[PDB]
Amino acid sequence: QLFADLSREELTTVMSFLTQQLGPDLVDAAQARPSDNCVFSVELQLPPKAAALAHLDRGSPPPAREALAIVFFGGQPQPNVTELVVGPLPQPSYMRDVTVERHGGPLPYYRRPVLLREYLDIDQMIFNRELPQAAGVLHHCCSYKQGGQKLLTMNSAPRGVQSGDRSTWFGIYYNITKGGPYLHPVGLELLVDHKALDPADWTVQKVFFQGRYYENLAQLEEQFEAGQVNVVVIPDRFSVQGNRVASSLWTFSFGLGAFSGPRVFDVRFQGERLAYEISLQEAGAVYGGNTPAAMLTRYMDSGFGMGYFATPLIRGVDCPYLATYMDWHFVVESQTPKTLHDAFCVFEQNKGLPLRRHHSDFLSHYFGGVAQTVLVFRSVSTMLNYDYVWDMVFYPNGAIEVKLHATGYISSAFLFGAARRYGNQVGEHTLGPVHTHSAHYKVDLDVGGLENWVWAEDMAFVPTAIPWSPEHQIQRLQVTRKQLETEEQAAFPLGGASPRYLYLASKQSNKWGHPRGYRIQTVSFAGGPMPQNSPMERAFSWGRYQLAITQRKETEPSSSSVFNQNDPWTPTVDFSDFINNETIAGKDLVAWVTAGFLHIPHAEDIPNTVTVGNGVGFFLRPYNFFDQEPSMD
Amino acid sequence: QLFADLSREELTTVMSFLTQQLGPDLVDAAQARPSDNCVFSVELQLPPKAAALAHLDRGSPPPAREALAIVFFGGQPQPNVTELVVGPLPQPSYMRDVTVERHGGPLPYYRRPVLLREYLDIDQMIFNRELPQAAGVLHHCCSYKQGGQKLLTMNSAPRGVQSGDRSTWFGIYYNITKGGPYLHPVGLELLVDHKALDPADWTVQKVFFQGRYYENLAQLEEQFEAGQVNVVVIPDRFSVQGNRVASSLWTFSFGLGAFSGPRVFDVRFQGERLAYEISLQEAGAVYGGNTPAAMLTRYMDSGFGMGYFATPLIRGVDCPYLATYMDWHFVVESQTPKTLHDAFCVFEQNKGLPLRRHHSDFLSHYFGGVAQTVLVFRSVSTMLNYDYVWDMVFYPNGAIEVKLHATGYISSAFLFGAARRYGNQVGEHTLGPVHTHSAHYKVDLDVGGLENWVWAEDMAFVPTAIPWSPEHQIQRLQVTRKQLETEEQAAFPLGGASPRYLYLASKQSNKWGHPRGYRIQTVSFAGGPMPQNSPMERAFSWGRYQLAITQRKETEPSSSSVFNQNDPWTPTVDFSDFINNETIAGKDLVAWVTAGFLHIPHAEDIPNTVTVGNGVGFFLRPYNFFDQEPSMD
Ligand SMILES: *[C@@H]1O[C@H](CO)[C@@H](O[C@@H]2O[C@H](CO)[C@@H](O[C@@H]3O[C@H](CO)[C@@H](O)[C@H](O)[C@H]3NC(C)=O)[C@H](O)[C@H]2NC(C)=O)[C@H](O)[C@H]1NC(C)=O
Ligand SMILES: *[C@H]1O[C@H](CO)[C@@H](O[C@@H]2O[C@H](CO)[C@@H](O[C@@H]3O[C@H](CO)[C@@H](O)[C@H](O)[C@H]3NC(C)=O)[C@H](O)[C@H]2NC(C)=O)[C@H](O)[C@H]1NC(C)=O
Ligand SMILES: *[C@@H]1O[C@H](CO)[C@@H](O)[C@H](O)[C@H]1NC(C)=O
Ligand SMILES: *[C@@H]1O[C@H](CO)[C@@H](O)[C@H](O)[C@H]1NC(C)=O
Ligand SMILES: *[C@H]1O[C@H](CO)[C@@H](O)[C@H](O)[C@H]1NC(C)=O
Ligand SMILES: [Ca+2]
Ligand SMILES: [Ca+2]
Ligand SMILES: [Ca+2]
Ligand SMILES: [Ca+2]
Ligand SMILES: [Cl-]
Ligand SMILES: [Cl-]
Ligand SMILES: [Cl-]
Ligand SMILES: [Cu+2]
Ligand SMILES: [Cu+2]
């Protein structure tokens, strides 16, 4: 099991090894301060593909099982963040700093994600030193400390306007013990500068209150005293062992990236591998509004972590009561492994739609079919307000469906001015702001082996004389085919035109002489790429494409980075860089899919948005890969 | 029950009345000859909407219940086809010829659909007088009358190259007891001219045999005698009463149009009507190939009948064993009513995806959700080789999903020459020819009443200085909104761009000041419109649009016609005619959706193609139609 996530035991071992080997004093990350040194996280380091295949296919010994550790080195003249490969598990003996060889240089400290202790300290500052200065205005709008509901804060990101910044607009909301505290904005937002290593030097650089901007809370309060601020009062058949799933028809290895999310490796249909890896790479949301956080937010969720933020699947609600559930173990912001109970679930679903069927007239007595049962692998990420359920469903005919379903609660903004220009009013003093939802997937298809080619097939109409009546013409329907040659030709612009039939194929043909292939059919209602003029769109440049094929490279494991979120102006990973006109004829190919939709909140979204529809994502379908409809057991 | 399809009793009554009022000159259509007079079909005549609404909403007496009869008047100097409104049911007293007032003039005789007795006679001619003339070439390729498999014919359409023609290329295939006879072409096709009223004057105007054309079968045979033709040997929670479905949340009336297919009327959510009618209008397929039938076929299925050709749903396969099944009754090509057992089925499906859910960190103890159970109304049309399952699914949040799933067997063509230019080889001597699958729906939404407006909403980015940092800009995401004014502006070109949020709205707003609305979200992978240069594309001009909104007109009940198939060059109904720049501001609006996909057959399609995916069609979703998430029972 070389693709299995590190276990509770391996997580503890690496940690012990790190404490022992790291000369600079370490602090439990759950309690670390900017200036401390701490281990931010440790998880599996995926092995090199060649070594993994030599093992899986040729029985060579397994590749050294390694872990990747992200260390925040804040206690030093020039703090940095460092990635260390530690291995070979069970008992490590080396610790390799690979930061520079993977990024060209050091990782600046302001790129590290904000720590939970950092959030807790920002909150102590806001509730103990900041808000009381505006007690008067706060009693008026919100019964602050006078029986009114408790207040709580809401993060936003990126944090600033250029590289180096760590200034975040935190919004103030009623802690209504109900469906979404973020559905009750107060209209108060604070720009706190928390870039300094000593929290004692943090400050609020600006404040936004119900439509107006102020220098600080003391100015808001004193102008309110002077009767100059109008305050609005705000009311209220298969088995699973280790990391492998096995069914009569399918077989694959599953896992969860702490930052990347759900992933699957070594997918095989009837013994034949169709893909080395299929995994989530990034999920994002771009917001609009006339209040600070709504107008500035551009999320690249791996910065928080689709794995880290994964939640327990509710039996009977998220998965069937009789589904098989599996646990996940991780070490993120703690020096002891945590286990996430019921992080995954696998079960068989009856689509209630006949898979195959045909009927006829009389004394042709042989018509019927079978129902369509599919195998589902599921997990759920809960990022602040939205819940993302990730699906990978395997069909009995060799097809795979990968989908994203968004549910949860929407984040709201205090309504004022030209608010409707940025969304819809969904309550009193509340606007539901516009945003897009995007997801990116890495699809490493190895069709009939490693060496693949990309084919673009479509239709065309060409008028031609009718043979049996030459005086008449007929718009002749036909298929068009072109073997793509370079990456540039296989980078299809979001919302643009792309071949209706696009597939990756091996050199060998099926019995009938057609290239064996697996095509990709995307399903999305994406909203329109962010203009490249944005000083930060390169950090999520995967959003420029609906689909893109490049050469699989050991040096390009991901289309995004945990480090992009707190510094999109100078991205740590710019997916578009992977597209550099290389040949895609007979190479190990990787397909990357973008899927998403536009969300203009509406009244039906309150108190919670529902999963109506079949999600967003893609299908991988066999196209002349077999010589006929494949068997089924 | 004014939307209910005519019952066996009413069907018998209308028929008795017609025999009585039309006298002796009548023959059972099951046995009629071109020159005979016969009743082709009788079914419900939908009532005027105003009268129906006055009855459903104001308790006015119901509209006269009537039937529409299509009579073939072939026994006369100038044969024609006539539509007669017969009524009031139970005991009819009048018979109104409405042909001229609905079409501007008489329906020419060659437009009538080919009768089953007509097909049977074409077959007697082919097997008794034609093929024997080529016994020698047929012995060789197919062991004709020497122990080889029986042969059978395959229809194609249109029939000719211009208005007035009734010449059809019939293909010859092995009749195999297995997975589809049309999967075994012989390479032999015959153009039979059956326009003449006396079958005795019918002739084969041309023959195609394995790549070459001939004048007739005697020429094929004698040239083969002359050792000049090389012959390839070819081997081998709710209740349903009457026509109304009732559930805790939904209520609607269902039915099946003999030619139009599944249909639903008076759809109500929590007592409020969302749509007067949602129904199938047409389904089509455009083929390509280098053999006669595949290069000429352009199907407009209503010409045969999605209702007429509907098949019994297989319990346990097409619908769950415990679903509720309903029968359908019809009079098509018979003088006695026929009943189609299990023509519909209704049941509750668990999508296996949580409808709503949210989770959190600690001591916010109130996270969970409910599973998503949906109501399904289903029926299946079996058109020759294709099986079309029509779904209408009603969600508990007010949303409706309408889909088409294609399954069954592909029609094949004998492989020769440039075959691969028109499809993929899927067997020995067999090509699976390219084709598109299209379906058109009539969606008569009455959002908050009859008077509706169309809104186009989308997103846009506009760079704006950052208030708290004026030296910096930010691509500001926002919503754009435009009230469409005329039909021309709401006719969105297939494959073109269209607003991401398009909805029909009433004059009244919801509690938050936004127009109450239902948006249409289409889901298709259509192939590209037939060029308007085609002398026949006007007959299916609905294929030009992804979506179109027009004024509901009593005079424009359907976007197609049973009579278009045998005469597309001079269509009886040209949908684009409905788009004539009228106002769409505050009128009874009707939305028409087109959905489809491209199908390049592949090996996996043999012996039968599967329904992997979620079909093609559209979603109708509430957009500020409610004041919050609707309740659920
Ligand atoms: C399509 O064919 C229809 C069937 O033949 C035509 O309709 C028929 O036209 C006849 C000729 O006008 C009518 O006959 C008349 O019937 C009355 C009342 O029954 C007799 O008293 C009259 O003598 C006779 N007219 C005369 C003196 O010739 C039929 O009543 C009528 N049948 C029906 C069922 O409508 C259509 O006219 C033809 N359509 C078009 C547009 O040409
Ligand atoms: C920022 O992050 C790391 C934390 O300081 C830096 O890595 C450390 O660099 C030190 C000096 O460059 C190394 O010290 C060496 O340790 C060995 C023991 O193996 C001593 O004998 C040497 O005298 C001492 N000096 C040198 C230069 O070798 C640390 O061992 C090393 N720690 C790790 C885990 O690598 C990174 O260099 C820095 N990042 C960047 C890119 O600048
Ligand atoms: C096909 O063969 C079966 C078996 O005899 C028979 O029922 C059928 O009528 C034959 N021809 C056609 C066109 O169905
Ligand atoms: C990529 O290379 C091809 C030749 O192989 C060239 O024609 C094309 O213009 C190049 N595109 C770019 C990105 O320069
Ligand atoms: C409506 O559109 C037609 C062409 O589509 C144009 O000729 C006409 O002037 C337009 N009239 C309107 C709606 O102003
Ligand atoms: Ca590259
Ligand atoms: Ca590959
Ligand atoms: Ca009109
Ligand atoms: Ca309407
Ligand atoms: Cl498939
Ligand atoms: Cl921006
Ligand atoms: Cl919805
Ligand atoms: Cu959203
Ligand atoms: Cu098809």
Short mmCIF file of C-alpha atoms in Angstrom, two decimals, chain B residues 27-343:
data_model
loop_
_atom_site.label_atom_id
_atom_site.label_comp_id
_atom_site.label_asym_id
_atom_site.label_seq_id
_atom_site.Cartn_x
_atom_site.Cartn_y
_atom_site.Cartn_z
CA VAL B 27 -62.08 1.21 -44.04
CA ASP B 28 -60.22 0.04 -40.96
CA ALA B 29 -56.85 1.83 -41.19
CA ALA B 30 -55.17 -1.42 -40.11
CA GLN B 31 -56.07 -2.64 -43.60
CA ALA B 32 -56.42 0.53 -45.67
CA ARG B 33 -54.81 1.01 -49.07
CA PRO B 34 -53.59 4.38 -50.41
CA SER B 35 -56.85 4.92 -52.29
CA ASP B 36 -59.12 4.07 -49.32
CA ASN B 37 -60.62 6.51 -46.82
CA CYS B 38 -59.70 5.73 -43.19
CA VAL B 39 -59.49 7.27 -39.72
CA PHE B 40 -55.78 7.46 -39.01
CA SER B 41 -56.05 8.41 -35.39
CA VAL B 42 -58.12 10.00 -32.66
CA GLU B 43 -56.98 11.45 -29.37
CA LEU B 44 -57.67 14.31 -26.95
CA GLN B 45 -57.93 17.80 -28.38
CA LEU B 46 -56.34 20.02 -25.68
CA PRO B 47 -58.82 22.73 -24.55
CA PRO B 48 -58.41 26.51 -24.86
CA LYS B 49 -56.22 27.71 -21.97
CA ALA B 50 -58.51 30.61 -20.98
CA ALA B 51 -61.52 28.32 -20.65
CA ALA B 52 -59.49 25.72 -18.80
CA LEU B 53 -58.18 28.35 -16.37
CA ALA B 54 -61.62 29.86 -15.83
CA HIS B 55 -62.66 26.35 -14.85
CA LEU B 56 -59.66 25.40 -12.68
CA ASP B 57 -59.37 28.78 -10.96
CA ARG B 58 -62.78 30.44 -11.08
CA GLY B 59 -65.07 27.43 -11.07
CA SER B 60 -66.58 28.18 -14.45
CA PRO B 61 -68.06 25.07 -16.06
CA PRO B 62 -65.43 22.95 -17.89
CA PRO B 63 -64.68 23.50 -21.59
CA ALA B 64 -66.32 21.16 -24.05
CA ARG B 65 -64.16 18.02 -23.97
CA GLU B 66 -63.14 17.26 -27.58
CA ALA B 67 -61.10 14.86 -29.70
CA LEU B 68 -59.01 15.50 -32.77
CA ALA B 69 -59.38 13.01 -35.62
CA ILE B 70 -56.98 12.77 -38.55
CA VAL B 71 -58.72 11.23 -41.56
CA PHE B 72 -56.93 10.08 -44.74
CA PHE B 73 -59.24 10.90 -47.62
CA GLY B 74 -57.61 8.94 -50.42
CA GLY B 75 -60.71 7.76 -52.27
CA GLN B 76 -61.33 10.96 -54.24
CA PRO B 77 -60.07 12.99 -57.26
CA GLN B 78 -57.89 15.13 -54.98
CA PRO B 79 -57.05 13.14 -51.86
CA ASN B 80 -56.16 15.06 -48.73
CA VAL B 81 -55.67 14.52 -45.03
CA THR B 82 -58.25 16.21 -42.78
CA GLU B 83 -58.28 17.10 -39.08
CA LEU B 84 -61.68 17.02 -37.43
CA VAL B 85 -62.54 18.32 -33.96
CA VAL B 86 -65.23 15.98 -32.63
CA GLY B 87 -67.26 16.83 -29.58
CA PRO B 88 -68.52 17.38 -26.78
CA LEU B 89 -67.57 14.14 -25.03
CA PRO B 90 -69.39 11.82 -23.79
CA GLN B 91 -71.87 12.08 -26.65
CA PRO B 92 -70.58 14.00 -29.68
CA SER B 93 -72.95 16.04 -31.85
CA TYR B 94 -70.58 17.96 -34.11
CA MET B 95 -67.66 17.31 -36.45
CA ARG B 96 -65.58 20.38 -37.42
CA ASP B 97 -63.04 20.32 -40.24
CA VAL B 98 -60.28 22.62 -38.96
CA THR B 99 -57.51 21.67 -41.44
CA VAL B 100 -57.71 24.87 -43.45
CA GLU B 101 -57.95 27.22 -40.48
CA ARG B 102 -54.84 25.67 -38.86
CA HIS B 103 -52.64 25.36 -41.95
CA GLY B 104 -53.87 27.91 -44.48
CA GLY B 105 -55.04 25.30 -46.91
CA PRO B 106 -55.38 21.55 -47.58
CA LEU B 107 -52.82 19.01 -46.31
CA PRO B 108 -51.41 17.26 -49.37
CA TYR B 109 -51.77 13.46 -49.39
CA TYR B 110 -48.07 12.63 -49.66
CA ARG B 111 -47.62 14.22 -46.21
CA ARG B 112 -49.59 11.49 -44.45
CA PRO B 113 -47.46 9.10 -42.43
CA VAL B 114 -46.77 5.71 -43.96
CA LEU B 115 -49.40 3.27 -42.81
CA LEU B 116 -48.46 -0.13 -41.30
CA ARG B 117 -50.45 -1.84 -44.08
CA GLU B 118 -48.38 0.32 -46.41
CA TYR B 119 -45.14 -1.03 -44.90
CA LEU B 120 -46.48 -4.56 -45.06
CA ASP B 121 -47.32 -4.15 -48.77
CA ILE B 122 -43.94 -2.56 -49.50
CA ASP B 123 -42.46 -5.70 -47.90
CA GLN B 124 -44.59 -8.12 -49.91
CA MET B 125 -43.36 -6.33 -53.02
CA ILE B 126 -39.70 -6.50 -51.94
CA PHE B 127 -39.78 -10.17 -50.91
CA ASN B 128 -42.06 -11.52 -53.62
CA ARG B 129 -41.25 -9.44 -56.69
CA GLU B 130 -37.89 -7.72 -56.09
CA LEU B 131 -35.19 -9.72 -54.22
CA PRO B 132 -35.83 -12.96 -56.15
CA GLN B 133 -34.52 -11.18 -59.26
CA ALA B 134 -31.18 -11.09 -57.44
CA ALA B 135 -31.27 -14.58 -55.94
CA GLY B 136 -27.79 -15.34 -57.27
CA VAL B 137 -26.00 -12.38 -55.72
CA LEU B 138 -28.07 -12.86 -52.55
CA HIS B 139 -27.20 -16.57 -52.30
CA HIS B 140 -23.58 -15.60 -52.39
CA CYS B 141 -23.60 -12.76 -49.83
CA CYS B 142 -26.16 -14.15 -47.56
CA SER B 143 -27.23 -17.77 -48.23
CA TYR B 144 -30.57 -16.33 -49.35
CA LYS B 145 -33.16 -19.15 -49.15
CA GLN B 146 -30.36 -21.65 -48.54
CA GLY B 147 -30.36 -21.88 -44.76
CA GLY B 148 -29.18 -18.35 -44.12
CA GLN B 149 -30.87 -16.05 -41.63
CA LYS B 150 -34.15 -14.45 -42.64
CA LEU B 151 -33.93 -10.94 -44.00
CA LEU B 152 -36.00 -7.98 -42.93
CA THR B 153 -36.29 -4.34 -43.97
CA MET B 154 -35.44 -1.03 -42.33
CA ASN B 155 -37.30 2.25 -42.94
CA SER B 156 -35.56 5.63 -43.45
CA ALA B 157 -36.88 9.18 -43.96
CA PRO B 158 -37.54 11.79 -45.34
CA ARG B 159 -38.70 10.05 -48.52
CA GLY B 160 -37.37 11.73 -51.66
CA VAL B 161 -35.62 15.00 -52.43
CA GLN B 162 -38.53 17.42 -52.73
CA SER B 163 -42.18 18.07 -51.81
CA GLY B 164 -44.45 15.46 -53.38
CA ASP B 165 -41.99 12.57 -53.11
CA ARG B 166 -42.68 9.28 -51.39
CA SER B 167 -39.60 7.28 -52.37
CA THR B 168 -37.89 5.54 -49.47
CA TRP B 169 -34.56 3.78 -49.19
CA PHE B 170 -35.26 0.54 -47.34
CA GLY B 171 -32.22 -1.33 -46.10
CA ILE B 172 -31.90 -5.12 -45.86
CA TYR B 173 -30.69 -6.70 -42.61
CA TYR B 174 -30.34 -10.18 -41.13
CA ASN B 175 -33.23 -10.78 -38.71
CA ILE B 176 -31.28 -11.96 -35.70
CA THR B 177 -33.06 -13.26 -32.59
CA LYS B 178 -30.53 -11.24 -30.56
CA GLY B 179 -29.37 -7.71 -29.79
CA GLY B 180 -30.87 -5.85 -32.71
CA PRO B 181 -31.42 -6.83 -36.37
CA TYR B 182 -30.18 -3.47 -37.71
CA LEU B 183 -26.71 -4.29 -36.39
CA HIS B 184 -26.34 -6.72 -39.29
CA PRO B 185 -26.55 -4.88 -42.65
CA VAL B 186 -26.25 -6.87 -45.92
CA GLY B 187 -25.14 -3.78 -47.86
CA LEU B 188 -28.34 -3.90 -49.92
CA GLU B 189 -30.72 -0.93 -50.05
CA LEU B 190 -33.71 -0.27 -52.33
CA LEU B 191 -35.31 3.05 -53.24
CA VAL B 192 -38.95 2.14 -53.60
CA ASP B 193 -41.40 4.66 -55.04
CA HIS B 194 -44.69 4.15 -53.23
CA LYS B 195 -46.34 7.47 -54.02
CA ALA B 196 -48.95 5.88 -56.27
CA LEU B 197 -52.39 5.15 -54.84
CA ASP B 198 -52.42 1.65 -56.38
CA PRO B 199 -49.51 -0.44 -54.94
CA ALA B 200 -49.54 -2.25 -58.29
CA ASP B 201 -47.80 0.80 -59.78
CA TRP B 202 -45.01 0.93 -57.15
CA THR B 203 -41.42 0.38 -58.31
CA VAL B 204 -37.84 0.32 -57.07
CA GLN B 205 -36.24 3.40 -58.64
CA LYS B 206 -32.67 2.56 -57.78
CA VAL B 207 -30.57 0.08 -55.88
CA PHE B 208 -27.44 0.33 -53.77
CA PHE B 209 -25.36 -2.73 -53.18
CA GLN B 210 -22.16 -2.82 -51.16
CA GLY B 211 -20.78 0.48 -52.44
CA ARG B 212 -22.11 0.65 -56.00
CA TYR B 213 -25.41 1.93 -57.39
CA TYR B 214 -27.61 0.14 -59.92
CA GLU B 215 -30.72 0.87 -61.95
CA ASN B 216 -32.65 -2.10 -60.59
CA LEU B 217 -32.10 -5.61 -59.25
CA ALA B 218 -32.09 -7.25 -62.69
CA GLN B 219 -29.06 -5.11 -63.57
CA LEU B 220 -27.30 -6.05 -60.31
CA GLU B 221 -27.96 -9.73 -60.93
CA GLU B 222 -27.00 -9.82 -64.60
CA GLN B 223 -23.83 -7.81 -64.01
CA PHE B 224 -22.95 -10.29 -61.27
CA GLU B 225 -23.64 -13.13 -63.74
CA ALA B 226 -21.16 -11.32 -66.04
CA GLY B 227 -18.57 -11.76 -63.31
CA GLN B 228 -18.46 -7.98 -62.87
CA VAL B 229 -19.67 -7.51 -59.29
CA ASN B 230 -17.46 -8.54 -56.42
CA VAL B 231 -19.75 -9.69 -53.59
CA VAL B 232 -18.68 -9.56 -49.93
CA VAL B 233 -20.13 -12.47 -47.95
CA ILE B 234 -21.75 -11.17 -44.74
CA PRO B 235 -21.32 -13.69 -41.83
CA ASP B 236 -23.71 -14.52 -38.99
CA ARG B 237 -45.97 9.78 0.26
CA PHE B 238 -47.98 10.25 -2.92
CA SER B 239 -51.04 9.03 -4.78
CA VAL B 240 -52.24 8.83 -8.36
CA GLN B 241 -55.90 9.05 -9.32
CA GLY B 242 -57.15 9.35 -12.88
CA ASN B 243 -54.69 11.69 -14.62
CA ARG B 244 -53.59 13.54 -11.49
CA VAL B 245 -50.55 12.88 -9.33
CA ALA B 246 -50.67 14.23 -5.80
CA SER B 247 -47.88 14.43 -3.27
CA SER B 248 -47.36 16.31 -0.03
CA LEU B 249 -45.54 18.95 -2.10
CA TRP B 250 -46.63 18.52 -5.73
CA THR B 251 -49.66 18.21 -7.87
CA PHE B 252 -49.96 17.87 -11.66
CA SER B 253 -51.94 16.18 -14.44
CA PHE B 254 -50.14 13.77 -16.81
CA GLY B 255 -50.66 12.27 -20.22
CA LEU B 256 -49.17 11.14 -23.47
CA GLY B 257 -49.59 12.76 -26.87
CA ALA B 258 -50.02 10.08 -29.56
CA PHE B 259 -47.40 11.90 -31.64
CA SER B 260 -45.99 14.43 -29.14
CA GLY B 261 -45.05 12.19 -26.26
CA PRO B 262 -45.09 12.70 -22.46
CA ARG B 263 -46.79 15.83 -21.23
CA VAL B 264 -47.81 17.34 -17.91
CA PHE B 265 -50.31 20.12 -17.15
CA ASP B 266 -51.29 22.37 -14.26
CA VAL B 267 -48.12 21.81 -12.28
CA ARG B 268 -48.58 23.15 -8.76
CA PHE B 269 -46.12 23.55 -5.91
CA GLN B 270 -47.75 23.96 -2.47
CA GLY B 271 -51.01 24.90 -4.16
CA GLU B 272 -49.50 27.44 -6.50
CA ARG B 273 -49.29 26.76 -10.24
CA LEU B 274 -45.77 27.18 -11.74
CA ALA B 275 -46.66 25.95 -15.18
CA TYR B 276 -49.79 25.43 -17.25
CA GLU B 277 -47.97 22.84 -19.32
CA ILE B 278 -44.59 21.18 -19.78
CA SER B 279 -44.45 18.75 -22.69
CA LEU B 280 -42.35 16.92 -25.29
CA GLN B 281 -42.79 18.47 -28.73
CA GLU B 282 -40.31 16.62 -30.92
CA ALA B 283 -37.29 14.33 -30.97
CA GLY B 284 -34.95 13.98 -33.91
CA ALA B 285 -31.78 12.42 -35.25
CA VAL B 286 -29.60 13.60 -38.14
CA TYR B 287 -27.40 10.97 -39.77
CA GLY B 288 -24.27 10.84 -41.86
CA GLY B 289 -22.76 8.10 -44.02
CA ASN B 290 -21.80 7.02 -47.53
CA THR B 291 -24.72 4.59 -47.92
CA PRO B 292 -28.21 5.92 -48.92
CA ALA B 293 -30.18 5.68 -45.64
CA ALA B 294 -27.40 6.95 -43.34
CA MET B 295 -26.59 9.94 -45.55
CA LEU B 296 -30.21 10.97 -46.06
CA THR B 297 -32.00 10.39 -42.74
CA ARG B 298 -33.35 13.30 -40.74
CA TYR B 299 -35.95 12.08 -38.29
CA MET B 300 -38.73 14.13 -36.78
CA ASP B 301 -40.14 11.33 -34.65
CA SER B 302 -43.58 12.77 -34.07
CA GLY B 303 -44.14 11.63 -37.64
CA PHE B 304 -44.29 8.10 -36.25
CA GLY B 305 -45.32 8.95 -32.67
CA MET B 306 -43.62 9.06 -29.26
CA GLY B 307 -46.92 8.09 -27.75
CA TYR B 308 -47.98 5.60 -30.42
CA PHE B 309 -44.53 4.00 -30.27
CA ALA B 310 -44.45 4.02 -26.47
CA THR B 311 -43.69 0.62 -24.87
CA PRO B 312 -44.60 -1.18 -21.66
CA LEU B 313 -42.26 -0.21 -18.80
CA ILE B 314 -40.46 -3.34 -17.50
CA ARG B 315 -41.13 -3.63 -13.75
CA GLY B 316 -37.90 -3.78 -11.82
CA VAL B 317 -35.83 -2.54 -14.79
CA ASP B 318 -37.44 0.67 -16.15
CA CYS B 319 -39.04 1.63 -12.87
CA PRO B 320 -38.75 0.14 -9.37
CA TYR B 321 -40.90 -2.95 -8.72
CA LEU B 322 -42.96 -0.98 -6.21
CA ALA B 323 -43.63 2.04 -8.40
CA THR B 324 -47.17 2.99 -9.35
CA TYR B 325 -47.90 2.11 -12.98
CA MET B 326 -50.55 3.59 -15.23
CA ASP B 327 -51.95 2.49 -18.58
CA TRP B 328 -52.49 4.56 -21.73
CA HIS B 329 -55.20 4.11 -24.40
CA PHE B 330 -55.04 5.12 -27.99
CA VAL B 331 -56.56 4.80 -31.45
CA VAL B 332 -53.89 4.94 -34.13
CA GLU B 333 -54.16 2.77 -37.27
CA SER B 334 -57.00 0.75 -35.76
CA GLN B 335 -60.77 1.16 -35.48
CA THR B 336 -60.83 -0.23 -31.97
CA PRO B 337 -58.98 1.36 -28.98
CA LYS B 338 -55.73 -0.29 -27.85
CA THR B 339 -54.35 -0.08 -24.36
CA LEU B 340 -50.64 0.16 -23.58
CA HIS B 341 -50.10 -1.56 -20.26
CA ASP B 342 -47.66 0.19 -17.93
CA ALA B 343 -47.12 3.19 -20.18
#
